[PDB]
Each structure stands twice: as structure tokens, then as C-alpha cells.
Amino acid sequence: DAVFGDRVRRFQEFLDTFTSYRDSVRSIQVYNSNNANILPHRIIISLDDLREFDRSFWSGILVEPAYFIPPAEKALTDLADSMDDVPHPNASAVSSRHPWKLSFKGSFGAHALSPRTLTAQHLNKLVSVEGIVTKTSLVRPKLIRSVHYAAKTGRFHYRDYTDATTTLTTRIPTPAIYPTEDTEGNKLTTEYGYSTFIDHQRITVQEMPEMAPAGQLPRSIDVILDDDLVDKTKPGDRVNVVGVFKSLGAGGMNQSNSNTLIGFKTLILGNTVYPLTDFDIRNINKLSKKKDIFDILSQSLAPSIYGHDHIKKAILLMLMGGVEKNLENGSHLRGDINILMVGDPSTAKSQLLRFVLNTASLAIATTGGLTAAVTTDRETGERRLEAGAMVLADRGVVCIDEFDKMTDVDRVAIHEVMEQQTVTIAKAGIHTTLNARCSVIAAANPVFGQYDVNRDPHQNIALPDSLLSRFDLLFVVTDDINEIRDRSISEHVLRTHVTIPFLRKYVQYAKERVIPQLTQEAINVIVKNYTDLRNDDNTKKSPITARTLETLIRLATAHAKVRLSKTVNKVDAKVAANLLRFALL
């Protein structure tokens, strides 16, 4: 109709009045011509610019996409096809026939929704949905335009097709298969090389648990993606997706089918996918030179816990971490540090773990699929692996609660994670190796509930010694009551009846830019302390092995990172030795 052409010309005027779009289109065209990889035929439209250009057209796109978006697509495709002559001898007949797709950015107005807030009132509108990608379907190509040759007539033919998903407006569907005869009735010669196909995939978006109330099942909605968006995401991705929420089929309206339970099927036609200072650095570097900066940073950690300075120091050093190395023989050296907590259950382990999980930027909570060696199947039957916490926490930290309750399979899997920082997957038809370079912090509790302070955790918790030896530091806490100190710490609870934003930047910068190496200063200290510990036959929390020396080196490197020094010094080794002696007592 004439309105379609009017809106096509209106979108052409929009494109011309802001040359910042069609100049990017020209740059894409030039880049594609130079490569005779190809950039996609997609541009992003600012919703505010469209609002300030034509309020009616922008409101139509938001509220009545079926009558406004296809004109805009036609206008953009015409502008792209008319801006150059396409002098390609053969590519002009195939590659130039792909329509151009639109994307939107800016303020969405009231169309900022979640899979729970998304309701039937929002149907037939362009809306933006925030959620998590639970799973993705299998990718298949889809026929768009068929080209064929009529040998008997000596000239070619073509045919187009429509589908309820790709067509925003309800055009007449075309269920016809690839034609064998044309209007002239002569048998057709198939031209696959000049036919057009577009890939397609379906994904499911579910509301984030961060806002989900209890007592109800989670809300999910399906999104359709095509062409360049077909394989851009993976399951478990936080995503902000803009698309047209559209219904399909019929809810028993045909024949009688008067069942009350039957409802109409709905989904979203996705078109845009958004997967989810120097002053501070200089202040960090200046603060690093103060003698008390380490203690200040330790006291900033865990403000809800009184005392436990050594545990806070260990947490800070573990966050700082060591330095990995590579050798000419192909060997690799572990740098990260692990911490284990033991003692009575409710005593301060939960609070410290909560602080660590909330403070760290890449902290993942675990408790008794962490092995990342299990497959999840799609609706069509095919299956894909799902990521595990030990693998996702690469270059991060793992927080474990009720570590004693984990299974033996988890233990035998985490042995390699803690030792070689890798995971060796060996299953029926699936074999792969994944990096697991993650720091581990865990809490465990005795069976009796009350820790026997006279004995090691090897009898209080009875975990395997090989598993325990993979933790660089161990701490035991138990509520040994001193009435005045308990009163002082519990007055804050009774009242209920360095800033963290800067500290996180401090840790980030220190781990990002500082890579300390060893120095002759620490060599003699390490050798002497290790020899003394070996010579010390008195009872200790754990025997002295080379893993203790590795822990000493890692702690020295972490302390150097706290000092942001690229070369270790004697003070780092002394602090590491003092901390290790404290942990062993």
C-alpha cells in the first residue's frame, strides 16, 4: 500500500538527516569490498534520535512494529543497494541480495521488562527483556528466496517465501516446497548456488534469581535469533535482549477445541543482543609505600569480625596470589593460594565466607556439576556440556561452605584442580582438558559440633591427608569464651535487637600490573626456614614438605604484590615465614 512506501521514504529521510548512520554503512561497504571475513548488514538506531525526528514513527516502532519496522528495513536495504554500483562480476548476484537488519539503542521508555513482568498486555510491541540464557537450540539454515533455471524457456526464475516468525505483519504464509515446475509448466533446473538461506536458532531467557520472590516457579520466555545473532551466546549468560514480543498459533479457536486450559503460544522476535582511574591508581601506589598499609587493608577486610587478623591477612594474600611460571621443558608452576577454615560451625565461618563472597569480583559459592563433566540436553535431543564452578572461577576464587559434605567424586576431581590447576575430563565420547586456575577458600565442621582442640582435623573431620595437604593455609577457630571480650563483640549484635570500593580497585591494580620475581634476599631465608622446619620434630598441624616451601614462595609473592614491588625482598619472606609458623602452631 501507499503507507508502506510513505514510511520507507520517512525512514530514508531519517537516514539522510543523520549522516552518521549511512556513513558507517559506507564504511562497512568499503571494508566488505576490500576483503574481496564480511561485516554483517546490521546497524544500530538510536531510539532518542528517532523520537526527536518523528515521534509518530518511533511510537509506531515501539507499539506497532508490524506496520513500521518492515518499511524501515526496506528503506535501509534500498539505501544500501543504491549507494554503490557493486562492480563485482559474480558476487553482485548473490551477496548483494541480503536485506539489512535494524538494531535499537537508547531509552526504551516503559519497555524495560523481565520474563515475569512480561505479560499479554505487552504483545505486538518492541520490548527489552533482561534475564539469563538457560539453554540454546540447534542451528539450522532457513530458506528465504529460491532461484532456479527453466531450461526449456532458456531463462531463470525466482520465488520468495514467508513465515510467521520472520514476518512481523501477518502476511499469507507460503508452505510451498522448492518448486519443480513454474507457471510455464516446464521442469526447473535447481540453482542452489544462487538461492538464499539464513541460519536460525531458538534461545530461552529466564528471569534472574536476584529479583525472584519465593513461593513461585521461575518465569521464562523464548527468543528467536537469525543470521548474525544465531550463535552469539552460550547457556548461563546474563543478557539484555530487545525484540518484538509476539504470539503465534491459536488457542483452540479452530473447530470446537473449547478446552479452557489451552492458551496461545507467545515468544519474542529478538533483534538486538547485549551480553552482560588514574587518580585511584596513583593513590593506590602512594598508599602502598606506607608501612601500615597492609594492616589497614587487613582491618578493612571483614568489619563484622573482631580479631582474626591472621585470617584477614591470609585472605588478602590469597586474593593477591602468586606468579605462574613457564619453563623451557614445557612445565608450568602453580602460583595461586588456598585457605581452609575449621572449627565449630556457627563460629564466624559463615560471616567471613559471606564477606569474601560479597567482596571478591569473581567469587562463586559452592557447597556439598562442579566438575563441569556433565551434559544438558536440548528439547530436540542433542546435548551440551554445562560449565562448573571450578572452571568458571578461572582467575577468580572459589568459596565452599560445608566442605566436609562434598562427595568423593568432587574430592578426586578437585585434587587436580588444586594441584595442577587443570581438569582432565574423560567420559564416553567426550575427552577434553580445561583450565582451573582458581583460588579456593573453604569451611569445614566436625561431626561432634565441638572441635577437639587437642587433635588435628585429620581426626576431628577425618578428611584425607592428600586432600588437606593441597591447602596452603589452615586456621581453626572456636568460641573460647572470655566474658568481657564476648560482651564487647556482642554489643554490636545487641544494638540490632580504606573503603571497600577503593580496596577492590587496589587489589585489581596490584594483581593486574605487578608480577614480582624472586630475589637473592629471599633465597637464603626460604632455605634456612625450610631446613629449620624440617629439623623441628615437635608436633604440628601438618608435616613439613616441599609444598610448604611452595606456600612460602607464593606468600612472599603475594606480600610483594601488596607492596606492588616487581622484585621480592627479605621482609616478604619474613612475613611469609611468620604467617606459616602461626598456621602450623
Partner: protein, 408 residues
């Protein structure tokens, strides 16, 4: 004829006055300003305003409630035009409620009032409310507002019309399961369940375990020779005498109230004063508090009787189950985690999977009595740990995960 009914509704909305104010007109105007297309009509005002339309509604509401919807929509649109979608009818009433067990084949299509506890709720479903259709043979278009598509064109062959999706409107609907209070169920009987349906603004207002008061229409639908499944069109959900208040205040004013109540707990048993007072404290229960971080302090008091056999320990629980207004009694041996706690089960009436509450979910806001607690399985105990300490139940079954609260 129905124009008189519409005019009467228009008067009852615009011109009815109570407390020297146009309460209905003002509340509808406030809803329009809030943009809530629903009107809460009180039946007690309707009976006092006009008895004939009340008789018609009570006897044959089948045409009255379409008239209600259209009249309210028209009046609200007039009010919006004066100040600057189909409005939903909501009914509030206080008349006597018929017992669920007394529902029969005589109350068909009659508006009734009920009370009970919600045990299961379904997911939302989208239902059509306004359609525009086109003939595939000749592209003739028309609009349609159980509904079925026309068999012949108005201008084409049988069933020529197809639905224009981008020019139609749809609404939400939810399916609910109601059952009578187990405290009102004599022993030897399973409480009767009842299917209820709500749409638009009445959806998602309740969760399993919620005790509600219902105003709705008793009706049946086809899903046994001729066993047609009954279902309720929800119209309104709500969830002591002055002399009783004075009597209980005097009871509170009694200088020996605590000892009187202590003796009142199982007077047919001797001694055991300490456990009697502890059970009294359990019956009253603690006070809820909320941390500034959003966590809730469990106010329930949980007591373990751990004495020698034959010390009236079972009799105390059996007496509390009589006394507590909300009480559930079950043996440890005859129960399971899927039965004590919530579970996901498929509803055969609507052919959909439903989240269904358990025994402890039913005891929300009350007391549960359990015996032979040492004889239940450890998984059940693990679930009971969550129920006791977090007042929540975590469900991970089939391919769905959810968390449901239980203040038991």
C-alpha cells in the same frame, strides 16, 4: 430492557453516596489515575442500593456479569474523558458462606461464597479477549469479541478465516486449587479439593498454603460416564464480636491468667507443669523480626520431647492438635519429604504440572505435631532443617527449581 440494568449500574457507580462522599465514583477515579482497570464492588452496598438487580445477579448472573463488565468499562471511560480496555469486576461480600462439602448440582451457575486454603497454583496462561480475523480466500476482514471462528465468509470454502495476530488482544489467566480447612475435616476423610480460575488483576495474589475467603460462581466444564469437572470463576478474594473482645480482654486482665491457662492445657493429665507452660509458649509463639539486610528471624518455637515412654508425651501433642486453630498431626513413619514438604505434581484436569504444598506447607502460620520423629529418614530431617531454621522449602525436581516459604 438491559439498558435499564446498565443505567442502574451507572447510577450505582456515579451517584451512589456513602459517608457523605461518592465513594464508588471516587474509588473508580482513583483506580483510573493509578491506571488499574478494575473496580471492587461491595455486594453489601449493592443489596442496599437495589434489590431487584441483586435478585437477578443471584439467580441468573450469566448475562448480568457481561453487563457489569461493559457498564463499568463505559462509565470508567466517561470518567476518564471527564478527567482528561475492559474493566474487571471485583466483588467484596460478607454474607454467609456455604460449606465446600455442601456444594451440589443445585447451585449450578449461582454465585456462592466459600473459604478454604490454597494448596496448589498453576503458571499463567494467555487467553484471547479481542480478535481480528481475515479470510484467506478473499482477504475480507472482521473483528470478533466459548468463542469460535466463523465457518463461512461474510463476503470461500469451509473455515476460511485466519487470525490477524498483530491486531488482537489477549489477557492472562491462572488456575488455582482450593480445599477445605483440615481442622474442619473430621477424621477418616481426605479434605475435598476444588478447582478455581482467576484472570487479569486477580492472578498471582495467592500461593499454596494461603487461607482465603472466596466470592465466585459455581460452574462446570467438560474435561466416568458424565463426570463434568466443576470449577469456580473467581470474583473476589479476601485474605471477633465486641462482647467476645471484652471477654478475652477480661481474661487477659485476670490476675491468675497464666496459671489458669497452664492448668487448662490437658487438665485430664497430672503434673507436668513445666512442659505445660512450654507448650503454652509454643501455642503463643514468638514475635517475628526482620534484619536490616532483609533476613527474617524465625519466631517459631520448636520443642523436642525426649523422655521415657509412657509419660503422656503423645497425649500432649494430640491435645495441642485440638487446641491450636491451625494444627497438623502426622506420624514420622507414615510421612515423607515429598509429603511433609511441597512437591511438583501434574494436574490431570488442566494437563499441566502444578506446584503442590505439603503437610508442613499447610501448617503455615500454625503448629505441626509429629510423633516417632526419631524414625523418619535423614533426607526428611534435612528438609525439616530448612523448614525450621530458614522458614523456607527448596524444591529441585524434574527440570524446575523453586523455593517456598513455610512459617510452621
Amino acid at each position: 430492557d438491559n439498558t435499564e440494568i446498565i443505567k442502574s449500574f451507572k447510577n450505582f457507580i456515579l451517584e451512589f453516596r456513602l459517608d457523605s462522599q461518592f465513594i464508588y465514583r471516587d474509588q473508580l477515579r482513583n483506580n483510573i489515575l493509578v491506571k488499574n482497570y478494575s473496580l471492587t464492588v461491595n455486594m453489601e452496598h449493592l443489596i442496599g442500593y437495589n434489590e431487584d438487580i441483586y435478585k437477578k445477579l443471584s439467580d441468573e448472573p450469566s448475562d448480568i456479569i457481561p453487563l457489569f463488565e461493559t457498564a463499568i468499562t463505559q462509565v470508567a471511560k466517561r470518567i476518564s474523558i471527564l478527567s482528561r480496555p475492559t474493566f474487571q469486576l471485583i466483588l467484596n461480600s460478607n454474607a454467609n458462606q456455604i460449606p465446600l462439602r455442601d456444594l451440589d448440582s443445585e447451585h449450578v451457575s449461582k454465585i456462592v461464597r466459600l473459604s478454604g486454603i490454597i494448596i496448589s497454583t498453576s503458571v499463567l496462561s494467555s487467553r484471547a479477549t479481542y480478535l481480528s480475523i481475515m479470510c484467506r480466500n478473499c482477504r475480507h476482514t472482521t473483528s470478533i469479541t466459548t468463542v469460535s471462528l466463523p465457518r463461512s465468509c461474510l463476503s470461500c470454502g469451509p473455515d476460511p478465516y485466519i487470525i490477524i495476530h498483530e491486531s488482537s488482544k489477549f489477557i492472562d489467566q491462572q488456575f488455582l486449587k482450593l480445599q477445605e480447612i483440615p481442622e474442619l475435616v473430621p477424621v477418616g476423610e481426605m479434605p475435598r479439593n476444588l478447582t478455581m480460575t482467576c484472570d487479569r488483576y486477580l492472578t498471582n495474589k495467592v500461593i499454596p498454603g494461603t487461607r482465603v475467603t472466596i466470592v465466585g460462581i459455581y460452574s462446570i466444564y467438560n474435561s466416568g460416564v458424565a463426570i463434568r469437572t466443576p470449577y469456580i470463576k473467581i470474583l473476589g478474594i479476601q485474605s471477633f464480636t465486641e462482647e467476645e473482645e471484652e471477654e478475652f480482654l477480661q481474661l487477659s486482665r485476670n490476675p491468675k491468667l497464666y496459671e489458669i491457662l497452664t492448668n487448662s492445657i490437658a487438665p485430664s493429665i497430672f503434673g507436668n507443669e513445666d512442659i505445660k507452660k512450654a507448650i503454652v509458649c509454643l501455642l503463643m509463639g514468638g514475635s517475628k523480626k526482620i534484619l536490616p539486610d532483609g533476613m527474617r528471624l524465625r519466631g517459631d518455637i520448636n520443642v523436642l520431647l525426649l523422655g521415657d515412654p509412657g509419660t503422656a508425651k503423645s497425649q500432649l501433642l494430640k491435645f495441642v492438635e485440638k487446641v491450636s486453630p491451625i494444627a497438623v498431626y502426622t506420624s514420622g513413619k507414615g510421612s515423607s519429604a515429598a509429603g511433609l514438604t511441597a512437591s511438583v505434581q501434574r494436574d490431570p484436569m488442566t494437563r499441566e504440572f502444578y506446584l503442590e504444598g505439603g503437610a508442613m506447607v499447610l501448617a503455615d502460620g500454625g503448629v505441626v505435631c509429629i510423633d516417632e520423629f526419631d524414625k523418619m529418614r535423614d533426607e526428611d530431617r534435612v528438609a525439616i532443617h530448612e523448614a525450621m531454621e530458614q522458614q523456607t522449602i527448596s524444591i529441585a525436581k524434574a527440570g524446575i527449581t523453586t523455593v517456598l516459604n513455610s512459617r510452621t
